Amino acid sequence: MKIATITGVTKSPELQVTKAIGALILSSDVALSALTTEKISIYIERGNGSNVILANKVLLKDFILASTYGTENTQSDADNAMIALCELADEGSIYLADKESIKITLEDLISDKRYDLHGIEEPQQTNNLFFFEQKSVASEEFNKKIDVQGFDLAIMTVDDSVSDLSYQYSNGQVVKYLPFELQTLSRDIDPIQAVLSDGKVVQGLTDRLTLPLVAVVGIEINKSQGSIINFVVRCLKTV
Amino acid sequence: MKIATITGVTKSPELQVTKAIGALILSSDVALSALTTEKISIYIERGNGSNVILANKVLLKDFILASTYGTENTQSDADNAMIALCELADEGSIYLADKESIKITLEDLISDKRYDLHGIEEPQQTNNLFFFEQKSVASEEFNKKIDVQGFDLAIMTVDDSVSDLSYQYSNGQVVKYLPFELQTLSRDIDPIQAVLSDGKVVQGLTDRLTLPLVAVVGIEINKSQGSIINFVVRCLKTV
Amino acid sequence: MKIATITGVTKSPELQVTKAIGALILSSDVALSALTTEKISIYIERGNGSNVILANKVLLKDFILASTYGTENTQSDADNAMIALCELADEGSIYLADKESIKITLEDLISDKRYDLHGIEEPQQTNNLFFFEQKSVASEEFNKKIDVQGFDLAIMTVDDSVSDLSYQYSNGQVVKYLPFELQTLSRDIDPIQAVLSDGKVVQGLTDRLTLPLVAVVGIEINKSQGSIINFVVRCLKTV
Amino acid sequence: MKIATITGVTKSPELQVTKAIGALILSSDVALSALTTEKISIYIERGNGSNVILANKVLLKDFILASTYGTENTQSDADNAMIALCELADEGSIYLADKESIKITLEDLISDKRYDLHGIEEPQQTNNLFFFEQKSVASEEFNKKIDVQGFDLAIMTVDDSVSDLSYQYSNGQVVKYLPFELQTLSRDIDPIQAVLSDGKVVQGLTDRLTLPLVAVVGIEINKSQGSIINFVVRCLKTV
Numbered sequence: 001m002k003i004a005t006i007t008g009v010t011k012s013p014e015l016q017v018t019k020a021i022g023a024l025i026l027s028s029d030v031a032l033s034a035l036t037t038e039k040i041s042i043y044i045e046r047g048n049g050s051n052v053i054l055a056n057k058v059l060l061k062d063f064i065l066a067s068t069y070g071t072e073n074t075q076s077d078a079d080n081a082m083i084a085l086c087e088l089a090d091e092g093s094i095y096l097a098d099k100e101s102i103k104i105t106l107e108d109l110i111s112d113k114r115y116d117l118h119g120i121e122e123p124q125q126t127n128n129l130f131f132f133e134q135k136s137v138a139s140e141e142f143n144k145k146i147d148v149q150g151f152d153l154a155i156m157t158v159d160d161s162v163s164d165l166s167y168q169y170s171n172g173q174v175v176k177y178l179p180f181e182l183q184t185l186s187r188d189i190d191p192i193q194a195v196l197s198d199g200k201v202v203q204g205l206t207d208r209l210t211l212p213l214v215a216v217v218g219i220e221i222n223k224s225q226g227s228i229i230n231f232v233v234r235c236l237k238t239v
Numbered sequence: 240m241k242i243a244t245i246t247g248v249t250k251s252p253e254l255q256v257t258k259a260i261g262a263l264i265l266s267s268d269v270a271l272s273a274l275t276t277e278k279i280s281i282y283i284e285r286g287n288g289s290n291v292i293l294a295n296k297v298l299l300k301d302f303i304l305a306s307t308y309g310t311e312n313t314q315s316d317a318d319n320a321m322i323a324l325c326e327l328a329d330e331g332s333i334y335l336a337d338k339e340s341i342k343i344t345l346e347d348l349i350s351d352k353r354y355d356l357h358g359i360e361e362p363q364q365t366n367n368l369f370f371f372e373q374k375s376v377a378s379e380e381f382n383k384k385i386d387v388q389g390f391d392l393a394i395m396t397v398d399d400s401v402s403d404l405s406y407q408y409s410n411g412q413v414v415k416y417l418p419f420e421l422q423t424l425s426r427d428i429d430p431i432q433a434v435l436s437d438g439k440v441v442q443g444l445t446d447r448l449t450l451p452l453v454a455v456v457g458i459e460i461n462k463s464q465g466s467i468i469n470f471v472v473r474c475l476k477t478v
Numbered sequence: 479m480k481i482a483t484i485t486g487v488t489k490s491p492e493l494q495v496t497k498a499i500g501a502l503i504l505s506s507d508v509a510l511s512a513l514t515t516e517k518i519s520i521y522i523e524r525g526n527g528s529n530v531i532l533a534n535k536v537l538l539k540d541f542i543l544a545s546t547y548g549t550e551n552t553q554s555d556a557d558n559a560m561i562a563l564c565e566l567a568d569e570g571s572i573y574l575a576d577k578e579s580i581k582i583t584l585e586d587l588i589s590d591k592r593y594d595l596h597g598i599e600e601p602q603q604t605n606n607l608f609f610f611e612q613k614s615v616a617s618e619e620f621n622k623k624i625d626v627q628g629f630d631l632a633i634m635t636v637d638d639s640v641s642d643l644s645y646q647y648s649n650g651q652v653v654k655y656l657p658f659e660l661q662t663l664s665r666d667i668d669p670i671q672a673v674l675s676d677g678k679v680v681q682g683l684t685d686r687l688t689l690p691l692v693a694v695v696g697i698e699i700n701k702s703q704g705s706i707i708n709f710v711v712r713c714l715k716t717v
Numbered sequence: 718m719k720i721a722t723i724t725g726v727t728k729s730p731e732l733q734v735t736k737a738i739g740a741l742i743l744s745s746d747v748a749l750s751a752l753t754t755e756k757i758s759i760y761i762e763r764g765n766g767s768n769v770i771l772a773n774k775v776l777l778k779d780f781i782l783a784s785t786y787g788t789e790n791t792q793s794d795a796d797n798a799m800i801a802l803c804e805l806a807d808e809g810s811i812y813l814a815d816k817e818s819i820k821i822t823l824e825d826l827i828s829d830k831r832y833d834l835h836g837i838e839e840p841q842q843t844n845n846l847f848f849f850e851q852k853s854v855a856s857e858e859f860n861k862k863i864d865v866q867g868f869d870l871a872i873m874t875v876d877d878s879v880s881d882l883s884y885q886y887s888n889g890q891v892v893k894y895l896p897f898e899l900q901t902l903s904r905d906i907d908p909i910q911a912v913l914s915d916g917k918v919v920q921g922l923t924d925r926l927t928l929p930l931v932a933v934v935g936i937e938i939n940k941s942q943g944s945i946i947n948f949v950v951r952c953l954k955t956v
């Protein structure tokens with residue numbers, strides 16, 4: 001069902017959903033490439049316990065790209081320049097116990113734009129949920145190793161100062177990759193990334209890269225100074 | 240083989256095919272979005288028993304859309320502005336006895352256009368066939384229940400007077416959607432509906448909506464008064 | 479890794495690859511429709527006797543079209559006008575026994591265009607390899623039968639003289655197709671052949687057609703005199 | 718044997734050595750104290766397997782200082798202003814197996830300068846090799862503790878922010894040193910670090926310090942905010 005419509009304000013109010021949903025539809029008149037600083041934060045609140053945080057100030061571009069990788073792609077309309085569907089659980093929907101609800105907030109919005117939220121319910125309830133985490137490589141340092149065991153998808157910020165990537169697999173084999181090779185490998189699973197309103201397609205953003213991780217237990221990044229690199233990693237687990 | 244080429248008239252001659260075909264190819268110089276009133280009628284004239292009716296004046300837009308849902312789409316050559324492949328059977332082709340035939344006819348054409356029919360033969364024979372049925376919702380009706388048990392695909396005429404549509408599943412849950420929600424959810428299965436000659440792609444017609452029915456046993460329509468809603472449903476069965 | 483950057487010459491030198499690779503990346507500033515006479519030759523050199531010939535002076539267009547059939551398609555970029563990923567083995571990379579290495583070369587290049595090779599490494603090794611063969615039908619004859627058993631993919635040249643293409647399957651059934659029917663049927667599996675730089679798509683090349691051979695043991699060509707018809711077939715086998 | 722000469726370019730091509738060498742001779746017309754940002758990278762390559770990295774983008778000053786500590790020192794001549802010999806194995810040459818080779822590259826050079834590489838081989842072969850690693854202390858942190866167990870040498874960045882540095886020995890005792898005390902103890906073992914072309918000698922550099930770690934299992938560095946501090950450590954292990 002329709003959740004909220006935000007316009008004319010920089011910060012969206014705390015939105016509460018008491019109905020068990022399975023996915024969220026984000027629709028806005030801002031094109032996906034034009035999104036700059038919008039952030040989202042979704043979690044599950046319990047009456048007599050600690051909250052369960054699924055996302056925490058995740059960038060809208062990273063959230064959309066992580067949630068729409070595969071056969072699907074973000075679409076458009078005559079009135080909305082961006083429509084995306086992002087699922088919060090595998091197969092079924094989220095099971096809500098007593099005194100349990102869902103809370104969604106939006107931050108860093110543009111004054112003269114529009115945003116909408118829609119909730120998508122399912123005929124089933126499941127215990128598996130999606131979590132989003134962030135890993136940063138600082139600008140001052142040169143190389144860094146980050147452990148991505150248990151994750152199945154990552155989003156890299158694309159920059160020209162990054163030179164080398166290293167993948168360590170489960171069987172201990174280490175493979176060397178370049179940004180060009182990584183982009184070409186990424187575009188062999190989901191060729192088209194988005195469809196524009198006028199009819200043209202875009203096969204990938206110029207500042208984000210979607211890395212599918214299978215049997216990967218580590219990522220080493222070799223770069224130079226002057227820029228900060230960010231990874232948005234997605235995982236599935238039972239709460 | 241080439242069945243017919245029709246131009247200059249408003250009604251097709253009663254065409255007959257004796258060879259066992261499994262699929263039809265409809266080609267025309269009229270774009271997919273420019274089809275208005277053309278209709279098709281297909282039926283197999285059996286010799287031992289009753290005849291088989293596969294399509295009874297089905298509108299050409301819905302006939303094309305109900306067959307090209309999934310990995311495929313309707314294409315366009317440099318000469319023909321619309322080419323579509325529509326299957327009449329499952330896997331193999333239609334099994335025909337010594338003197339049986341398949342009779343096809345077209346109605347409500349345009350005198351300054353051209354329509355071309357092709358038939359595809361297949362190595363195997365089968366008895367399973369696809370049936371296209373038509374359902375209607377009256378102008379004075381408020382809410383209506385339709386049993387879609389056994390079907391797997393429907394096409395509805397998009398109208399502004401339709402408020403809600405509710406899916407009833409096999410296990411007994413009822414989920415109420417919206418037109419926008421249904422469009423978004425259906426666009427994630429076949430993100431591309433057609434490809435134009437100039438290279439632009441179209442992700443969906445603005446006046447038809449395709450609904451895939453998986454484990455769905457009921458459809459409830461809630462709308463206002465003053466319009467007739469049209470559904471074209473496809474089913475697979477053995478005759 | 480980086481293999482070669484050929485620019486300013488009409489013939490690339492012999493290139494040796496010592497470590498195991500499983501895929502090549504061909505990149506250039508000429509689009510898929512701008513490749514005319516470029517040829518590629520890949521083989522495996524054994525130190526003490528005999529070589530394994532995978533591809534010998536195969537046209538670059540046919541090599542690219544025989545590898546990117548299916549979900550994938552040839553990519554573009556803001557700098558590279560064509561990128562194509564062609565796998566040289568199934569699943570893993572090519573296993574190398576004692577004292578052998580891969581060797582690649584190019585012929586018939588345009589002296590004012592840029593070509594680049596990249597290699598892809600994998601964490602697995604395999605024995606299966608992809609072999610490419612070429613078949614021809616002369617210009618002074620009318621009909622001819624060719625035997626394609628064991629090949630899973632073929633590429634034929636498209637000419638106006640081709641009238642009928644008869645298939646012969648493993649159960650003995652014979653089906654006669656037309657060029658239009660073949661073109662329509664081949665686009666039901668891969669509807670998009672390439673994605674252009676500006677955001678448009680192309681569903682196929684004008685002079686080349688791709689035929690997937692499943693349960694097919696023979697082909698017959700009925701054509702008029704005037705043009706030589708060329709086939710490039712791909713097979714998978716162990717070495 | 719001679720490997721390569723570099724002049725004009727800021728980056729060296731990936732240099733391959735197939736003959737088993739045991740030491741590298743680096744020659745340049747810029748004095749040892751004049752090196753600013755030149756980097757070196759060396760690794761052993763297996764044709765079908767994983768590479769064995771010995772040094773990955775190590776500063777040339779640190780590479781030279783970590784190998785010429787003791788009785789030896791970097792020398793010079795009328796033509797070459799800096800000649801340094803760096804050993805890559807324990808007491809023989811690298812034993813290359815069936816398909817291994819050696820790859821060396823140089824990065825971030827100066828356009829108007831000259832660099833020369835030479836290789837030294839000897840009748841003995843061995844498996845023990847020298848590995849180079851790098852450790853860092855952030856520019857915002859006060860007190861840091863690092864582990865140096867198993868390493869036999871370190872090159873630290875001399876900065877005026879350093880106040881205290883305490884060793885921890887294998888018997889449990891902790892001794893605190895100042896920069897002046899550390900420099901004096903370092904020059905107590907190796908008094909002369911280089912001999913200039915004209916005839917003067919230099920005892921050590923103004924920004925790098927060499928620490929021999931004998932029976933030391935931990936280091937604690939106590940400083941103030943302002944800058945990053947780099948350690949380059951070296952170890953010997955069997956491949």
